[PDB]
Structure 1
């Protein structure tokens, strides 16, 4: 992807995720999330947000999202995001924490979901209330690093 210089890791923690895939059992497992911000020198110092999902018991379980400042403009509209690119990672971190802290008896309840598909996977954090699954964020990840 982007060669990040001055890259800074903002978040590096395990998160409980409901991993869904067609034809397979749903598995609830801890996945490692790393959120990095950086400047792409090969691309006129564009700011990049990188999120990497990995498993410490499967070296081939690898999912990566990269969002540049330019990618964010479309993301912001599609997802109804109201803050700027700089403030976006903090909001994601807050959502991940709600998933980490979620208890089985919660109402409403937050959960992280990763649906694995062909050459792509969709990560979402949803708030489940009495009558629907309310999506707080939906993000597309590509396989690998």
Structure 2
């Protein structure tokens, strides 16, 4: 049962500059590999699912993952003021990732991907940094597994 990696469609798969924070470590800027795929559940091809994988490349192939069923999306959508439907969601995330990829140090507003790892969870956000403040454009929670 569950997400069928077998027939999933990958929409985006490449490195993205990320500003990482752990409690007991120095801040780091790392290119992390981001992958966004849509698919369906094996036991029911009618269940639509979105999956996002974040990872540092290593021979462990170890991932942090987020999985959002179309059902989960209803709640996620309302908690973040998201205005698009489930099908359009990945594309909106991808556009934000592209701005992070494009961003250069003098930009203003500047787009930046940020990751904070605490306990068994990572919180990923894409923020804009402007002459006034930093503010989030999207926030996503990830988990190992």
Q: TM-score per shorter chain, which class?
A: over 0.9
Distance across 2 between alignment mates of 1:109 and 1:72: 28
SS in 1 for 2:88: helix
Give 1:43 shift.
4.5
Moved more, 2-11 or 112-121: 2-11
Moved more, 55-64 or 126-135: 55-64
Structure 2 unaligned regions, length at least 5: none
Inter-CA distance 66–28: structure 2 relative to 1 (3 Å threshold):
same
Structure 1 unaligned regions, length at least 5: none
Distance across 1 between alignment mates of 2:97 and 2:60: 23
Give 1:132 shift.
1.8
| CA displacement, residues 112-131 of structure 1 (integer Å, 9 cap, x when unaligned) | 01111111110000001122
Inter-CA distance 123–58: structure 2 relative to 1 (3 Å threshold):
farther
Distance across 1 between alignment mates of 2:136 and 2:5: 30
Distance across 1 between alignment mates of 2:110 and 2:41: 37
Give 1:42 shift.
1.9
Backbone CA RMSD of aligned residues: 1.6
User: TM-score, length-normalised on structure 1?
Assistant: 0.92
Distance across 2 between alignment mates of 1:17 and 1:58: 20
Distance across 2 between alignment mates of 1:10 and 1:60: 20
The answer to whether the 8 A contact 1:123-1:140 is kept is yes
Partner of residue 85, structure 2: 84
User: TM-score, length-normalised on structure 2?
Assistant: 0.92
Partner of residue 75, structure 1: 76
SS in 1 for 2:34: strand
SS in 2 for 1:66: strand
The answer to whether the 8 A contact 1:5-1:41 is kept is no
Give 1:41 shift.
2.8
**Residue correspondences, number:** 144
Distance across 2 between alignment mates of 1:61 and 1:21: 17
The answer to whether the 8 A contact 2:3-2:39 is kept is no
Give 1:9 shift.
0.5
Partner of residue 51, structure 1: 52
